[PDB]
């Protein structure tokens, strides 16, 4: 949520490993941009008749690399080492 604009990114890719998050890269493409204008602080997930990771977004600088077809192949974190 950026200054009243809710943006949704996503990705659906099959994975070979079944242990944890595999090693590799997978970019995300925007789908929905909605300016409702609600400044949120708590959220939940609902169900009917398991396991979901959660991470927090922080300001940073990256160095993205684009291939010949405009798809990110890799990125470098700037203030790491």
């Amino acid at each position: 949520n950026i200054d009243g604009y809710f943006k949704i990114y996503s990705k659906h890719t099959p994975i070979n490993l079944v242990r944890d998050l595999p090693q590799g890269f997978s970019a995300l493409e925007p789908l929905v941009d909605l300016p409702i204008g609600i400044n949120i602080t708590r959220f939940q997930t609902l169900l009917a008749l398991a396991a979901y990771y959660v991470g927090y977004l922080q300001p940073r600088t990256f160095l993205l690399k684009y291939n010949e077809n405009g798809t990110i192949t890799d990125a470098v974190d700037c203030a790491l080492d």
Partner: protein, 55 residues
Amino acid sequence: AYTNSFTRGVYYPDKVFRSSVLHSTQDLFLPFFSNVTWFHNPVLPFNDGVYFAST
């Protein structure tokens, strides 16, 4: 139950095409080699945007 998110959480920042170029971007990203909290009803806070992965 912290897990090291190796190289996950990178998205296209802007609605612009680019080919064979290296781009320096400043946006809300997930820092590399960070900790993700494994979960299993439990409500979670929403600071400024959440990266939600699931099986």
